[PDB]
RNA sequence: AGAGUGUAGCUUAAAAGCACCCAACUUACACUUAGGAGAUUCAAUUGACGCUCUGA
């Protein structure tokens, strides 16, 4: 029975004038726009870093296969296995203050 | 003179003598005036130092507008006063193409071709 | 074969504390909060404050910030479990309550004819188990610890050999779930080290190329 | 009865095994660019280009013109990169570009266009107007000297003659005023 | 590393202003959550 | 025309396709349909990481079957010194992906795990009965 | 110590075309619109800096 909160509640009706101050300033518009430009550059650098670590890690696992087929085939037969013991995986994100 | 009628199940239409075709790549803006032969009459791109040395960016609304002005000047000097522009709906509703069509119209180029005196 | 089948472990404790926000990032955080305020509506608190202000204006012509004051007093009372564990730990790189925003990997001091230096935890392939099995007996051949940890999967993560008839090193990977090391004064110098401090213990090919698979992000 | 294809089939080198692991075009524009590239490909079947295009000889149109100007690409590129660096270093340029209130000087653009790629654009205009076909029977020359020609109309007016603009015989009653940038010791010939 | 999808605002057209609130767990760990009222601090029993 | 070499230059239905549960590969291996559950107390931060997970799977060429939301649970906490209240909500977004090679698992997992945001939990399950 | 070498991620491209990043839209993706960041390792075909590969 699918019902969700993607719906808007009826409460939202006619009190949106807590912020009737859509009027920004020229300096504020410039500051916001320039900040967003610097955000675009930052996040491009971050995705470059993440692609680099992806490529490095896969490089190693393929190097594994390389230096596992240099030695022995039976070990490789288990190095390629769906290890059905780790799948249900949980990890809680980092908290702000330690316990 | 004949305009190439037909092709009424595909796009673009080939019933024109000249056409404005604009190519917005990732880095540059190129606008060409092409005969129906495929022969290119007059062209304006940001790949030229001509437009590069005055623009900040070669992919902005300013880039499309300035290419509009420069090709309009080249069209008037080449004698090309009329052409068809065949846009896509998102090109038509984009603001770069509005500034280009306004630049051509206010530079003298009329973007609708006159009809053929079939008789 | 002129090689020796040796596996190893890469037991990493996850970062516990959130990484601090860089200069650039904080500006957006302020900006995003600003536009969230500038595009919201219908705050029940704000409506209570505004309606009570207007009704008080009517009564004066002829509340909510008290709750705000109470909330701020209780928040001022509550101290936060601090995250300056650099000050809580000085420079004791053997304890697990060192740098909490970053990631630490285990490293124990060993002795060998080639190198009497720190190694990631080692095992030899007996003829009756998987290499994941070999890392799992490293888990029980360390020095009296209740390390409880998850193993990321059944596949290798590094091959950094040396020749001395060759120590083929078969670096695996795991993830520390909850466990802790017994005997805080462990005679085997276990040191819990980051990728940035990896150069205090790991010099070259067989041990310093591990930067390929230690993920600092 | 069947006859085997005379050459490669169009959608042939696409692997139909991993159709869901093959990349798709999600854009009408991207399909259109590929469509038009195939459309301009040669093709071994009967084509609109075969029946309607101009089938000129592949005689590789002989150049009959003065040799190309020689430039130093590294120095030119370095100068251009530094100039673009200065233009982007100007903050008001970024302000004007973001506010869409910038502009481009057409007179300067036209002058250095006449210096840089104007010769080749004029060559293409002449070829479109069929002047090489009718003057030199196919041979092409890049116009490497800007030949400024105008007609003195009124007392303070000139009607320029650029590349195919209309000039009435009333405006062309008397001889034009011409200017070609040259060096001393170079003899020349003008022909209308 | 835990910043990537952390920087984000409420991407809805009609939404209430949600206040930055610290929520302690039971082991004494705080997390930045969003709540309807400015209660700068909420305890979990 | 059928007798001509240009027969079928207009085929198009072999380029389109139209009319898997606990899939494996035998000697090689590849997991079945897996759901990335991503609950949080903040609808905002959950949605954001679900978007990040979807975008990284698309950049990693892992097939994403569907992004669907599991129902928001509003739980009420009552403490007394009747009791007062503090109504909390947990929102849960799930990214259902299909094809992950067993070698790649380590990498994908490490990366989603490392970037986990403050207060959002990742519970990767197989689609059997979660409906 | 010696070889393959050498345009940003890729190109029997020559300073390009695509890939890529942030906003708006979309549950999200995709599309689209607006923006964005970039490369020719260095000296008159070789010569001398960087990656990989081989060995001690």
Domains, in order of start, for chain E: 1-45 (6.20.130.20)
Q: What is the bridge-based pairing of β-strands B29-35 and C4-8?
A: unpaired
Question: Distance between CA D137 and CA D130 in Å, rounded?
Answer: 10
Question: Distance between CA C7 and CA C124 in Å, rounded?
Answer: 6
Q: Do F126 and F35 contact (CB within 8 A), yes or no?
A: yes
How is residue B59 written in tokens? 């992919």
Question: Distance between CA D103 and CA B94 in Å, rounded?
Answer: 20
Q: Do C106 and C120 contact (CB within 8 A), yes or no?
A: yes
Handedness of CA D129, D130, D131, D132 (dihedral sign): positive
- Cβ-based burial of C99 (10 A; exposed 0-12, middle 13-18, buried ≥19): buried
H or E element at residue A27: helix A26-69
So where are chain A's domains?
Answer: 1-99
Closest CA in chain A for residue C166: A71
* Angle (CA) E22 E27 E31, round 5°: 25
* Strand G near-CB residues (< 7 Å), F 81-110: 93
Q: Cα–chain-centroid distance for residue D83?
A: 25
CB atoms under 10 Å from CB of A33, counted, come to: 13
CA of B23 to C1' of G18 (A): 14
Q: B94: which nucleotide lies closest, measuring CA to C1'?
A: G33
* Residues 6 or more apart in contact with residue A73 via CB below 8 angstroms: none
Question: Distance between CA C156 and CA C169 in Å, rounded?
Answer: 10
Token look-up 């003179």 returns B1
Query: Alpha carbon of F20 to those of A83, B11, F17, F34, F125: distances in Å?
Result: 19, 40, 16, 10, 15
Q: Do C104 and C175 contact (CB within 8 A), yes or no?
A: no
The answer, yes or no, to whether the previous bond of F13 is cis (omega within 30 of 0) is no
> How many folded domains does chain B comprise?
1
* Angle (CA) F99 F105 F109, round 5°: 115
Question: Distance between CA D45 and CA D3 in Å, rounded?
Answer: 14
| Cβ within 8 Å of F, A 53-92 | 53-54, 57-58, 61, 77, 80-83, 87-92
Helix axes F43-59, F102-114, angle to 10 degrees: 150
Question: Distance between CA C40 and CA F44 in Å, rounded?
Answer: 14
The answer, yes or no, to whether the previous bond of C198 is cis (omega within 30 of 0) is no
CB atoms under 10 Å from CB of F37, counted, come to: 18
Question: Distance between CA B104 and CA B61 in Å, rounded?
Answer: 14
CB atoms under 10 Å from CB of D40, counted, come to: 10
Question: Distance between CA B97 and CA B54 in Å, rounded?
Answer: 20
Strand G, nucleotides < 7 Å from a protein CB: these are 15-38, 40
Q: Do F106 and C155 contact (CB within 8 A), yes or no?
A: yes
How is residue B7 written in tokens? 């092709």
Q: Specify the length of chain B in residues.
A: 119
The torsion angles phi and psi of C20, rounded to 5 degrees, stand at -65, 150
Token look-up 């266009």 returns D113
Class of the C92-216 domain?
A: alpha beta
Structural domain that includes position B107: 1-119
CA of C161 to C1' of G1 (A): 22
Alpha helix (H) residue ranges in chain C: 23-39, 44-61, 65-77, 85-89, 131-141
* Residue C96, SS3 per DSSP: coil
Name the residue facing B73 among D53, D110, D125 (closest C-beta). D110
Which experimental approach was used here? cryo-EM
CB atoms under 10 Å from CB of E12, counted, come to: 15
The minimum CA-CA distance between D28 and chain F, rounded to whole Å, is: 16
So where are chain F's domains?
Answer: 1-128
Question: Distance between CA F35 and CA F68 in Å, rounded?
Answer: 10
Handedness of CA F116, F117, F119, F125 (dihedral sign): negative
**What is the fold of A1-99?**
6.10.250
Q: Do A88 and F71 touch (CB under 8 A)?
A: no
Q: Do C157 and A61 touch (CB under 8 A)?
A: yes
What is the torsion angle, in degrees rounded to the nearest 10, for the CA atoms of residue D62, residue D68, residue D74 and residue D76?
-130
D62 forms bridges with which residues in the sheet? none
Question: Distance between CA F113 and CA C192 in Å, rounded?
Answer: 20
Contact of E24 with chain F, judged by CB distance below 8 Å, is answered with no
Q: Do F15 and F83 contact (CB within 8 A), yes or no?
A: no
Three-state SS sequence of chain F: CCCCCCCCCCCCCCCCCCCCCCCCCCCCCEECCEEEEEEECCHHHHHHHHHHHHHHHHHCCCCEEEEEEEEEEEEECCCCCCCCCCEEEEEEEEEEECCEEHHHHHHHHHHHHHCCCCCEEEEEEECCCCC
Question: Distance between CA F52 and CA E6 in Å, rounded?
Answer: 10
CB atoms under 10 Å from CB of D100, counted, come to: 13
How is residue A12 written in tokens? 């939202």
């Amino acid at each position: 029975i699918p019902i969700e909160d993607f719906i808007t509640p009826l409460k939202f009706l006619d009190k949106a004038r807590e912020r009737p101050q859509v009027e920004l300033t020229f300096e504020e518009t410039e500051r916001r726009a320039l900040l967003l430009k610097k955000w675009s550059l930052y996040k491009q650098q971050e995705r470059k870093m993440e692609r680099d670590t992806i490529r490095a890690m896969l490089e190693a696992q393929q190097e594994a296969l390389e230096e596992l087929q240099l030695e022995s085939p039976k070990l490789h037969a288990e190095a390629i296995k769906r290890d059905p013991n780790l799948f249900p995986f949980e990890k809680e994100g980092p908290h702000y203050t330690p316990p | 003179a004949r305009k190439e009628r037909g092709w009424r199940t595909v796009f673009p239409s080939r019933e024109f003598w000249h056409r404005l075709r604009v190519i917005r790549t990732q880095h540059h803006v190129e606008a060409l005036v092409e005969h129906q032969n495929g022969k290119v009459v007059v062209s304006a791109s940001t790949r030229e130092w001509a437009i590069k040395k005055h623009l900040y960016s070669t992919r902005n609304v300013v880039a499309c507008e300035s290419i509009g002005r420069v090709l309009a000047q080249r069209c008037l000097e080449a004698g090309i006063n009329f052409m068809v522009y065949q846009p896509t709906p998102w090109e038509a509703a984009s603001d770069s193409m509005k500034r280009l069509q306004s630049a051509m119209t206010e530079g003298g180029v009329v973007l609708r071709e006159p009809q053929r005196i079939y008789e | 074969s002129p090689w020796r089948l040796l596996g190893a472990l890469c037991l990493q404790r996850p970062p516990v504390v959130s990484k601090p926000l860089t200069p650039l990032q904080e500006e957006m955080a302020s900006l995003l909060q600003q536009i969230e305020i500038e595009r919201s509506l219908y705050s029940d608190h704000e409506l209570r404050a505004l309606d009570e202000n207007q009704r008080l204006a009517k009564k004066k012509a002829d509340l909510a910030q008290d709750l705000e004051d109470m909330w701020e007093q209780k928040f001022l009372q509550f101290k936060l479990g601090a995250r300056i564990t650099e000050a809580d730990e000085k420079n004791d790189r053997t304890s697990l309550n060192r740098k909490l925003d970053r990631n630490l990997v285990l490293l124990v001091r060993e002795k060998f004819g080639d190198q009497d230096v720190w190694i990631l935890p080692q095992a030899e392939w007996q003829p009756g188990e998987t290499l994941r099995g070999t890392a799992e007996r490293t888990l029980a051949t360390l020095s009296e610890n209740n390390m409880e940890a998850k193993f990321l999967g059944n596949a290798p993560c590094g091959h950094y050999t040396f020749k001395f008839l060759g120590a083929k090193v078969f670096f695996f990977k795991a993830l520390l779930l909850t466990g802790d090391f017994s005997q805080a004064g462990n005679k085997g110098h276990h040191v819990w080290v980051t990728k940035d401090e990896l150069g205090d213990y790991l010099k070259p090919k067989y041990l310093a190329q591990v930067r390929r698979f230690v993920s600092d992000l | 009865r069947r006859t085997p294809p005379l050459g490669p089939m169009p959608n042939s080198d696409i692997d139909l095994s991993n159709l869901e692991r093959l990349e798709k075009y999600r854009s009408f524009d991207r399909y259109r660019r590929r469509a038009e590239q195939e459309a301009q490909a040669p093709h071994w079947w009967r084509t609109y280009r075969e029946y309607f295009g101009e089938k000129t000889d592949p005689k590789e149109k002989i150049d009959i013109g003065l040799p190309p100007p020689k430039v130093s690409r590294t120095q030119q590129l370095l100068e251009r990169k530094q100039a673009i660096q200065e233009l982007r270093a100007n903050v008001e340029e970024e302000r004007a570009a973001r506010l869409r209130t910038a502009s481009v000087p057409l007179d300067a653009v036209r002058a250095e266009w006449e210096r840089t790629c104007g010769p080749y654009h004029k060559q293409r205009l002449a070829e479109y107007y069929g002047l090489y076909r009718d003057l030199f029977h196919g041979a092409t020359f890049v116009p490497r000297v800007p030949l400024h020609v105008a007609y003195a109309v009124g007392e303070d007016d000139l009607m320029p003659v650029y590349c195919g603009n209309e000039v009435t015989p009333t405006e062309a009653a008397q001889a034009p005023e011409v200017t070609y940038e040259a060096e001393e010791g170079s003899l020349w010939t003008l022909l209308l | 590393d835990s910043s990537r999808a952390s920087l984000t605002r409420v991407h809805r057209q009609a939404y209430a202003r949600l206040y930055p609130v610290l929520l302690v767990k039971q082991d004494g760990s705080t997390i930045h959550i969003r709540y309807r009222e400015p209660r700068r601090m909420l305890a979990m029993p | 025309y059928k007798t001509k070499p240009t027969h079928g230059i207009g085929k198009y239905k072999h380029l389109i396709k139209a009319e898997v549960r606990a899939i494996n590969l035998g000697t090689d291996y590849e997991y079945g349909v897996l759901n990335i559950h991503l609950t949080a107390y903040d609808m905002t931060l959950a949605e954001s990481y679900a978007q990040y997970v979807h975008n990284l799977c698309n950049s990693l060429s892992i097939k994403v079957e569907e992004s669907y939301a599991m129902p928001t649970k509003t739980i009420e906490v009552l403490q007394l010194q009747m009791l007062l209240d503090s109504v909390l909500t947990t929102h849960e977004r799930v990214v259902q992906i299909s094809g992950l090679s067993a070698t790649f698992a380590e990498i994908f997992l490490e990366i989603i795990q490392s970037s986990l945001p403050e207060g959002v939990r990742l519970s990767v399950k197989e689609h059997t009965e979660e409906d």
